[PDB]
Amino acid sequence: MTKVLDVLEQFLNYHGYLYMRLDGATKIEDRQILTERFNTDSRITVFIL
DNA sequence: GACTAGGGAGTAATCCCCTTGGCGGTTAAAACGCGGGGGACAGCGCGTACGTGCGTTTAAGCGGTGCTAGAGCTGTCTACGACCAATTGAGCGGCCTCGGCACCGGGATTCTCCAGGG
């Protein structure tokens, strides 16, 4: 459920976690750069899809 | 006359196709905002084309007339139209194409803007 994602988001911001998201309302190029950035790097902790 | 055999309907189980709602993904149309510029409109001047006063006539209303050819109603008949159905064919109800329409691409053609010099 998409309504769950933001429910997680304000939760994740409550714990000071570094995270990002990917759902069906994201532009294709933004989606590709997001997954490319997540493949590298290590500070970003959780990816919610 | 007593009981026997078989099949479509009565009862019933199988299938299974058909949809009710909700929810997510994704493209297209609608929604919103800015730079700038062209359309709206004021201020004005004028001239010349009507707005208006008065003289001097033709003309509709006036007042009447003597009828004259077209309009309304009186018979009267008779050519014709609204009354059954057999028909039987003119035409519609349902299906099966291939062709013109749908629509997009490569190109020639054409319509428009600018910053300069000419």
CSV table of all heavy atoms in Angstrom, one decimal, chain B residues 78-91:
chain,number,residue,atom,x,y,z
B,78,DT,P,-74.6,13.7,-63.9
B,78,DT,OP1,-75.6,13.7,-64.9
B,78,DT,OP2,-74.7,12.6,-62.9
B,78,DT,O5',-73.2,13.8,-64.5
B,78,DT,C5',-72.3,14.8,-64.1
B,78,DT,C4',-71.2,14.3,-63.2
B,78,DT,O4',-71.5,14.6,-61.8
B,78,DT,C3',-71.0,12.7,-63.2
B,78,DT,O3',-69.6,12.4,-63.3
B,78,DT,C2',-71.6,12.3,-61.9
B,78,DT,C1',-71.2,13.5,-61.0
B,78,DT,N1,-71.9,13.5,-59.7
B,78,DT,C2,-71.4,14.3,-58.7
B,78,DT,O2,-70.3,14.9,-58.8
B,78,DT,N3,-72.2,14.3,-57.6
B,78,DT,C4,-73.4,13.7,-57.4
B,78,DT,O4,-74.0,13.7,-56.3
B,78,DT,C5,-73.9,12.9,-58.5
B,78,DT,C7,-75.2,12.2,-58.4
B,78,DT,C6,-73.2,12.9,-59.6
B,79,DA,P,-69.0,11.7,-64.6
B,79,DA,OP1,-69.4,12.6,-65.8
B,79,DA,OP2,-69.4,10.3,-64.6
B,79,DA,O5',-67.5,11.9,-64.4
B,79,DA,C5',-66.9,13.2,-64.2
B,79,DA,C4',-65.9,13.2,-63.0
B,79,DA,O4',-66.7,13.2,-61.8
B,79,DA,C3',-65.0,11.9,-62.9
B,79,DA,O3',-63.7,12.3,-62.5
B,79,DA,C2',-65.7,11.1,-61.9
B,79,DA,C1',-66.3,12.1,-61.0
B,79,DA,N9,-67.6,11.7,-60.3
B,79,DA,C8,-68.6,11.0,-60.9
B,79,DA,N7,-69.6,10.7,-60.0
B,79,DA,C5,-69.2,11.3,-58.9
B,79,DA,C6,-69.8,11.4,-57.6
B,79,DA,N6,-71.0,10.9,-57.3
B,79,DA,N1,-69.2,12.1,-56.6
B,79,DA,C2,-68.0,12.6,-56.9
B,79,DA,N3,-67.3,12.6,-58.0
B,79,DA,C4,-68.0,11.9,-59.0
B,80,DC,P,-62.6,11.2,-62.3
B,80,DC,OP1,-61.3,11.8,-62.7
B,80,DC,OP2,-63.1,9.9,-62.9
B,80,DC,O5',-62.6,11.0,-60.7
B,80,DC,C5',-62.5,12.2,-59.9
B,80,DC,C4',-62.7,11.9,-58.4
B,80,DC,O4',-64.1,11.5,-58.2
B,80,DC,C3',-61.9,10.7,-57.9
B,80,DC,O3',-61.3,11.0,-56.6
B,80,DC,C2',-62.9,9.6,-57.8
B,80,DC,C1',-64.1,10.3,-57.5
B,80,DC,N1,-65.4,9.7,-57.8
B,80,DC,C2,-66.4,9.5,-56.9
B,80,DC,O2,-66.3,10.0,-55.7
B,80,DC,N3,-67.6,8.9,-57.2
B,80,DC,C4,-67.7,8.4,-58.4
B,80,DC,N4,-68.9,7.8,-58.7
B,80,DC,C5,-66.7,8.5,-59.4
B,80,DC,C6,-65.6,9.1,-59.1
B,81,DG,P,-59.9,10.5,-56.2
B,81,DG,OP1,-59.0,11.7,-56.5
B,81,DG,OP2,-59.6,9.2,-56.9
B,81,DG,O5',-59.9,10.3,-54.6
B,81,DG,C5',-60.5,11.3,-53.8
B,81,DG,C4',-61.1,10.6,-52.6
B,81,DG,O4',-62.4,10.0,-52.9
B,81,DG,C3',-60.3,9.5,-52.0
B,81,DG,O3',-60.4,9.5,-50.5
B,81,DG,C2',-60.9,8.2,-52.6
B,81,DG,C1',-62.3,8.6,-52.6
B,81,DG,N9,-63.0,7.9,-53.7
B,81,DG,C8,-62.6,7.7,-55.0
B,81,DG,N7,-63.4,7.1,-55.7
B,81,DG,C5,-64.5,6.8,-54.9
B,81,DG,C6,-65.8,6.2,-55.2
B,81,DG,O6,-66.2,5.7,-56.2
B,81,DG,N1,-66.6,6.2,-54.1
B,81,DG,C2,-66.3,6.8,-52.8
B,81,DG,N2,-67.2,6.7,-51.9
B,81,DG,N3,-65.1,7.4,-52.6
B,81,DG,C4,-64.3,7.4,-53.7
B,82,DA,P,-59.2,8.8,-49.6
B,82,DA,OP1,-58.5,9.9,-49.0
B,82,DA,OP2,-58.5,7.8,-50.5
B,82,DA,O5',-60.0,8.0,-48.5
B,82,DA,C5',-61.0,8.7,-47.7
B,82,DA,C4',-62.1,7.7,-47.2
B,82,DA,O4',-62.8,7.2,-48.3
B,82,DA,C3',-61.6,6.5,-46.4
B,82,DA,O3',-62.5,6.2,-45.4
B,82,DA,C2',-61.5,5.4,-47.5
B,82,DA,C1',-62.7,5.8,-48.4
B,82,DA,N9,-62.6,5.4,-49.8
B,82,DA,C8,-61.5,5.6,-50.6
B,82,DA,N7,-61.7,5.2,-51.8
B,82,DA,C5,-63.0,4.7,-51.8
B,82,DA,C6,-63.7,4.0,-52.8
B,82,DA,N6,-63.3,3.8,-54.0
B,82,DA,N1,-65.0,3.6,-52.4
B,82,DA,C2,-65.4,3.8,-51.2
B,82,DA,N3,-64.8,4.4,-50.2
B,82,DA,C4,-63.5,4.8,-50.6
B,83,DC,P,-62.2,5.0,-44.4
B,83,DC,OP1,-63.0,5.2,-43.2
B,83,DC,OP2,-60.7,4.8,-44.3
B,83,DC,O5',-62.7,3.7,-45.2
B,83,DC,C5',-62.9,2.5,-44.5
B,83,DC,C4',-64.2,1.7,-45.0
B,83,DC,O4',-64.6,2.4,-46.2
B,83,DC,C3',-63.9,0.3,-45.4
B,83,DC,O3',-64.1,-0.6,-44.3
B,83,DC,C2',-65.0,0.1,-46.5
B,83,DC,C1',-65.0,1.4,-47.2
B,83,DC,N1,-64.1,1.5,-48.3
B,83,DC,C2,-64.5,1.0,-49.6
B,83,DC,O2,-65.6,0.5,-49.7
B,83,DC,N3,-63.7,1.1,-50.6
B,83,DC,C4,-62.5,1.7,-50.5
B,83,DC,N4,-61.7,1.8,-51.6
B,83,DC,C5,-62.0,2.2,-49.2
B,83,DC,C6,-62.9,2.1,-48.2
B,84,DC,P,-63.0,-1.7,-43.9
B,84,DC,OP1,-63.1,-1.8,-42.4
B,84,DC,OP2,-61.8,-1.3,-44.5
B,84,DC,O5',-63.6,-3.0,-44.6
B,84,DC,C5',-62.8,-4.2,-44.5
B,84,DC,C4',-63.5,-5.4,-45.2
B,84,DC,O4',-64.1,-5.0,-46.4
B,84,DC,C3',-62.6,-6.5,-45.6
B,84,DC,O3',-63.4,-7.7,-45.7
B,84,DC,C2',-62.0,-6.0,-46.9
B,84,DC,C1',-63.3,-5.4,-47.5
B,84,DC,N1,-63.1,-4.3,-48.4
B,84,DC,C2,-63.2,-4.4,-49.8
B,84,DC,O2,-63.4,-5.6,-50.3
B,84,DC,N3,-63.0,-3.4,-50.6
B,84,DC,C4,-62.8,-2.2,-50.1
B,84,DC,N4,-62.6,-1.2,-50.9
B,84,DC,C5,-62.7,-2.0,-48.7
B,84,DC,C6,-62.8,-3.0,-47.9
B,85,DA,P,-62.7,-9.2,-45.5
B,85,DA,OP1,-63.7,-10.1,-45.9
B,85,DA,OP2,-62.2,-9.2,-44.1
B,85,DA,O5',-61.5,-9.2,-46.5
B,85,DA,C5',-60.5,-10.2,-46.2
B,85,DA,C4',-59.8,-10.6,-47.5
B,85,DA,O4',-59.8,-9.5,-48.4
B,85,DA,C3',-58.3,-10.9,-47.4
B,85,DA,O3',-57.9,-11.7,-48.5
B,85,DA,C2',-57.7,-9.5,-47.5
B,85,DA,C1',-58.5,-9.0,-48.7
B,85,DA,N9,-58.6,-7.5,-48.8
B,85,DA,C8,-58.4,-6.6,-47.8
B,85,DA,N7,-58.6,-5.4,-48.2
B,85,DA,C5,-58.8,-5.5,-49.6
B,85,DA,C6,-59.0,-4.6,-50.6
B,85,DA,N6,-59.0,-3.2,-50.4
B,85,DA,N1,-59.2,-5.0,-51.9
B,85,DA,C2,-59.2,-6.3,-52.1
B,85,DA,N3,-59.0,-7.3,-51.2
B,85,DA,C4,-58.8,-6.8,-50.0
B,86,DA,P,-58.2,-13.3,-48.5
B,86,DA,OP1,-59.6,-13.5,-48.6
B,86,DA,OP2,-57.4,-13.9,-47.3
B,86,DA,O5',-57.5,-13.8,-49.8
B,86,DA,C5',-57.9,-13.3,-51.1
B,86,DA,C4',-57.0,-13.8,-52.2
B,86,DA,O4',-56.6,-12.7,-53.0
B,86,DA,C3',-55.7,-14.4,-51.8
B,86,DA,O3',-55.2,-15.2,-52.9
B,86,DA,C2',-54.9,-13.2,-51.5
B,86,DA,C1',-55.4,-12.2,-52.5
B,86,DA,N9,-55.6,-10.9,-51.9
B,86,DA,C8,-56.0,-10.6,-50.7
B,86,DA,N7,-56.1,-9.3,-50.4
B,86,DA,C5,-55.8,-8.7,-51.6
B,86,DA,C6,-55.8,-7.4,-52.0
B,86,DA,N6,-56.0,-6.4,-51.1
B,86,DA,N1,-55.4,-7.1,-53.3
B,86,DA,C2,-55.1,-8.1,-54.1
B,86,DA,N3,-55.1,-9.4,-53.8
B,86,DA,C4,-55.5,-9.6,-52.6
B,87,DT,P,-53.7,-15.7,-52.8
B,87,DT,OP1,-53.6,-16.9,-53.7
B,87,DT,OP2,-53.3,-15.9,-51.4
B,87,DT,O5',-52.8,-14.5,-53.4
B,87,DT,C5',-53.2,-14.0,-54.7
B,87,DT,C4',-52.3,-12.8,-55.1
B,87,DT,O4',-52.7,-11.6,-54.4
B,87,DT,C3',-50.8,-13.0,-54.7
B,87,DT,O3',-50.0,-12.5,-55.7
B,87,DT,C2',-50.6,-12.2,-53.4
B,87,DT,C1',-51.5,-11.1,-53.7
B,87,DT,N1,-52.0,-10.3,-52.6
B,87,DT,C2,-52.1,-8.9,-52.6
B,87,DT,O2,-51.8,-8.3,-53.6
B,87,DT,N3,-52.5,-8.3,-51.5
B,87,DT,C4,-52.8,-8.9,-50.3
B,87,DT,O4,-53.2,-8.3,-49.3
B,87,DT,C5,-52.7,-10.3,-50.3
B,87,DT,C7,-53.1,-11.1,-49.0
B,87,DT,C6,-52.3,-11.0,-51.4
B,88,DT,P,-49.6,-13.4,-57.0
B,88,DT,OP1,-50.8,-13.6,-57.8
B,88,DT,OP2,-48.9,-14.6,-56.5
B,88,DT,O5',-48.6,-12.5,-57.8
B,88,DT,C5',-48.5,-11.1,-57.5
B,88,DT,C4',-47.2,-10.8,-56.7
B,88,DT,O4',-47.6,-10.6,-55.3
B,88,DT,C3',-46.2,-12.0,-56.6
B,88,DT,O3',-44.9,-11.5,-56.8
B,88,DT,C2',-46.4,-12.5,-55.2
B,88,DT,C1',-46.7,-11.2,-54.5
B,88,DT,N1,-47.3,-11.4,-53.1
B,88,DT,C2,-47.7,-10.3,-52.4
B,88,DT,O2,-47.6,-9.2,-52.8
B,88,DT,N3,-48.2,-10.6,-51.1
B,88,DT,C4,-48.4,-11.9,-50.6
B,88,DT,O4,-48.9,-12.0,-49.5
B,88,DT,C5,-48.0,-13.0,-51.4
B,88,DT,C7,-48.1,-14.4,-50.9
B,88,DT,C6,-47.4,-12.7,-52.6
B,89,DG,P,-44.2,-11.5,-58.3
B,89,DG,OP1,-45.3,-11.6,-59.3
B,89,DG,OP2,-43.2,-12.6,-58.2
B,89,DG,O5',-43.4,-10.2,-58.4
B,89,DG,C5',-44.1,-8.9,-58.3
B,89,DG,C4',-43.6,-8.1,-57.1
B,89,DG,O4',-44.1,-8.6,-55.9
B,89,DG,C3',-42.1,-8.1,-57.0
B,89,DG,O3',-41.7,-6.8,-56.5
B,89,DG,C2',-41.9,-9.2,-55.9
B,89,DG,C1',-43.0,-8.9,-55.0
B,89,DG,N9,-43.4,-9.9,-54.1
B,89,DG,C8,-43.2,-11.3,-54.3
B,89,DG,N7,-43.7,-12.0,-53.3
B,89,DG,C5,-44.1,-11.1,-52.3
B,89,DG,C6,-44.7,-11.2,-51.1
B,89,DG,O6,-44.9,-12.3,-50.4
B,89,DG,N1,-45.0,-10.0,-50.5
B,89,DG,C2,-44.8,-8.8,-51.0
B,89,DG,N2,-45.2,-7.7,-50.3
B,89,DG,N3,-44.3,-8.6,-52.2
B,89,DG,C4,-44.0,-9.8,-52.8
B,90,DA,P,-41.0,-5.7,-57.4
B,90,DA,OP1,-42.1,-5.3,-58.4
B,90,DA,OP2,-39.7,-6.2,-57.9
B,90,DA,O5',-40.7,-4.5,-56.4
B,90,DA,C5',-41.8,-3.7,-55.9
B,90,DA,C4',-41.4,-3.1,-54.5
B,90,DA,O4',-41.6,-4.1,-53.5
B,90,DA,C3',-40.0,-2.6,-54.4
B,90,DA,O3',-40.0,-1.5,-53.5
B,90,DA,C2',-39.2,-3.8,-53.9
B,90,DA,C1',-40.3,-4.5,-53.0
B,90,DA,N9,-40.2,-6.0,-53.1
B,90,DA,C8,-39.7,-6.7,-54.1
B,90,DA,N7,-39.8,-8.0,-53.9
B,90,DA,C5,-40.4,-8.1,-52.7
B,90,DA,C6,-40.8,-9.2,-52.0
B,90,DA,N6,-40.6,-10.5,-52.4
B,90,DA,N1,-41.5,-9.0,-50.8
B,90,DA,C2,-41.7,-7.7,-50.4
B,90,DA,N3,-41.3,-6.6,-51.0
B,90,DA,C4,-40.7,-6.9,-52.2
B,91,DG,P,-38.6,-0.9,-52.9
B,91,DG,OP1,-38.9,0.5,-52.4
B,91,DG,OP2,-37.5,-1.1,-53.9
B,91,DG,O5',-38.3,-1.8,-51.6
B,91,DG,C5',-39.3,-2.0,-50.6
B,91,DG,C4',-38.8,-2.7,-49.4
B,91,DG,O4',-38.8,-4.2,-49.6
B,91,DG,C3',-37.3,-2.4,-49.1
B,91,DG,O3',-37.1,-2.3,-47.7
B,91,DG,C2',-36.6,-3.7,-49.6
B,91,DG,C1',-37.6,-4.7,-49.2
B,91,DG,N9,-37.4,-6.0,-49.9
B,91,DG,C8,-36.8,-6.2,-51.1
B,91,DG,N7,-36.8,-7.5,-51.5
B,91,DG,C5,-37.5,-8.1,-50.4
B,91,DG,C6,-37.7,-9.5,-50.3
B,91,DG,O6,-37.5,-10.4,-51.0
B,91,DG,N1,-38.4,-9.8,-49.1
B,91,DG,C2,-38.7,-8.8,-48.1
B,91,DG,N2,-39.4,-9.2,-47.0
B,91,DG,N3,-38.5,-7.5,-48.3
B,91,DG,C4,-37.8,-7.2,-49.4
